[PDB]
Design a protein around this ligand. Structure first.
Ligand SMILES: C[n+]1cn([C@@H]2O[C@H](COP(=O)(O)OP(=O)(O)OP(=O)(O)OC[C@H]3O[C@@H](n4cnc5c(N)ncnc54)[C@H](O)[C@@H]3O)[C@@H](O)[C@H]2O)c2nc(N)[nH]c(=O)c21
Ligand SMILES: C[n+]1cn([C@@H]2O[C@H](COP(=O)(O)OP(=O)(O)OP(=O)(O)OC[C@H]3O[C@@H](n4cnc5c(N)ncnc54)[C@H](O)[C@@H]3O)[C@@H](O)[C@H]2O)c2nc(N)[nH]c(=O)c21
Ligand SMILES: [Y+3]
Ligand SMILES: [Y+3]
Ligand SMILES: [Y+3]
Lengths: 300, 297
């Protein structure tokens, strides 16, 4: 049974970002303006066209689809096709109320690479963590069974070595070509890859092996069909591991941000302090203050 | 008006990309019309980008939505918009030939984690038996080919290399900038052949490579993603230079290795690349895949 936007009104302020290639758009709207003091609140609405489901496509092209002809020559031709309802799903995400840090992160990527030494991390990044980081209340809600409980795909309930595996916010669950799940560990205070030590190895292995095994049993998808990894920098500073279909070229799966869990585990087995000592490469917005901070602790 | 045929029986998904919301289908058409004898068609379908004004308008009309879930300030929904947002770009090849089929066909991939042993016992023996030609490299290195496009060359036979646009780039804009660097010293097959003796070749590549791109394109190093493939397609060490902003195919973690961390990895673990297990993806029909899977069963 269908619902409405969790707010009234939406008046466009700004296209934070759009991409014709990815068929996606992120908008900052003013909402609820006809109440209280008349200023309203900020929201972000994100609209993404969805992947095709080949069977519905094959069934459509078997009949007489609604078409207009755009180019014609001999054996080539391009139409505009207007499918029935069922092929038109647009994946819609709402952030509301949206904070100033949301508005910043969803804006116009003009990105710069940076190489962060262990020392740059203790000295510069760590003490500046608040400014990179978003509320993890949603993570607590899942771990506490207050949101998304009926979506949980698997749980290892151990307080220390356990975790919850659930469909990622980006996956609309309608097909397996873009399978995307997330594992969040039960244990609090592991912010990111920089916190990881051999003490976490049991936790890591369980995410890797019981996560893959749970995906094999739920979706029949084999581990050699999965790309399993973490982000550095993450947006939410509670360790989280991303399980994607390998043939899905997921945004954020690039060598400049993604780290395979299998390698992370073996890195720890070979090199207990590897994540505190070594240098990690990632991208930051041009104008992000932390970039400036870091550029200045290494140039001179 | 109409599709150029009647009936569609799916024969094969030649290629798909959920990320780009595109599929390439081969179907059999006309099987319940004319003589009864079906033909070949390719039909490519692609979702369209949004238009701001149509989206704004839809949103201020407060539409109805099917809730997927909510959590705190977050929520997601299925939206079934009115016709004007729903257009699909439908390209048809009819009748299509076996050439059209081969043009669009892509193999599905499979992950493998190749130990240092796996590489010694299985991949290396396989690759000396079977490899794609590295002539085209040779042609460049010794000026018979593409000398009209060199961006930079350091000639030192032991640590030098030539830097040319990759064929993937039409050179009309810097958005999708892509270059390869091929080294002068011969027989470096891939990453698996790298040791601390390579440190000058590597350093060389990264550093003079960036300087060349700076002077030629006005593009700073922090704007560049620089890396090698494992497994490469061509077994003569080759370094890839792409614009940071360009989400280049093949820059995924399951394939790409940052040049600079390959360097530091040599510095702290001299045997790294002969001992450590490396991860990569193979085509479903690659004989190497069956070999590795059989060795690890
Ligand atoms: C709030 N939240 C985030 N995730 C998922 O948790 C992971 C956190 O992962 P991470 O810490 O490594 O950070 P990441 O940067 O990947 O997450 P973010 O959500 O900021 O995604 C990165 C970028 O991808 C882009 N993007 C494409 N679609 C969306 C979308 N729908 N929402 C936000 N960003 C999107 C944005 O440009 C964004 O900055 C992400 O994969 C996110 O979908 C959630 N999953 C559930 N199940 N319930 C949640 O409530 C939830
Ligand atoms: C022949 N050639 C190739 N390159 C470029 O050299 C680099 C070699 O780099 P690499 O050794 O690590 O190989 P990579 O795997 O990147 O090569 P490429 O993208 O071309 O892969 C090879 C081929 O296999 C095909 N292919 C890739 N995946 C699939 C799949 N999944 N299914 C079916 N076919 C696939 C490709 O379309 C292509 O024909 C590539 O980035 C390539 O564009 C060249 N550059 C110049 N300047 N002059 C050349 O003549 C030249
Ligand atoms: Y006020
Ligand atoms: Y006011
Ligand atoms: Y079915």
């Amino acid at each position: 049974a269908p619902v409405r936007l969790p707010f009234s009104g939406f008046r466009l302020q700004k296209v934070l970002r759009e991409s014709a290639r990815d068929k996606i758009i992120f908008l900052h709207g003013k909402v609820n303006e006809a109440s209280g003091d008349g200023d309203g609140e900020d929201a972000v609405v994100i609209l993404e066209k969805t992947p095709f489901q080949v069977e519905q496509v094959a069934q459509l092209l078997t009949g007489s689809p609604e078409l207009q002809l755009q180019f014609s020559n001999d054996i080539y031709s391009t139409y505009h096709l207007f499918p029935p309802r069922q092929l038109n799903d647009v994946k819609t995400t709402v952030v509301y109320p949206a904070t100033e840090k949301h508005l910043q992160k969803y804006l116009r990527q003009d990105l710069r690479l940076i190489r962060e030494t262990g020392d740059d991390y203790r000295n510069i990044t760590l003490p500046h963590l608040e400014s990179q980081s978003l509320s993890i209340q949603w993570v607590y809600n899942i771990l506490d069974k207050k949101a998304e409980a009926d979506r949980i795909v698997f749980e290892n309930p151990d307080p220390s070595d356990g975790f919850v595996l659930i469909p990622d916010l980006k996956w609309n669950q309608q097909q397996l070509d873009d399978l995307y799940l997330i594992a969040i560990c039960h244990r609090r205070g592991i912010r990111s890859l920089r916190d990881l030590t051999p003490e976490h190895l049991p936790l890591l292995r369980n995410i890797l092996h019981q996560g893959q095994e749970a995906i094999l049993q739920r979706y029949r998808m084999k581990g050699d069909h999965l790309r399993v990894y973490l982000h550095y920098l993450p947006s939410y500073y509670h360790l989280n591991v991303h399980f994607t279909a390998l043939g899905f070229e997921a945004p954020g799966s690039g060598v400049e941000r993604a780290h395979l869990l299998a390698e992370v585990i073996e890195n720890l087995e070979c090199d207990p302090r590897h994540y505190q000592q070594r240098t990690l490469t990632f991208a930051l917005r041009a104008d992000d203050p932390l970039l400036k901070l870091l550029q200045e602790a290494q140039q001179s």
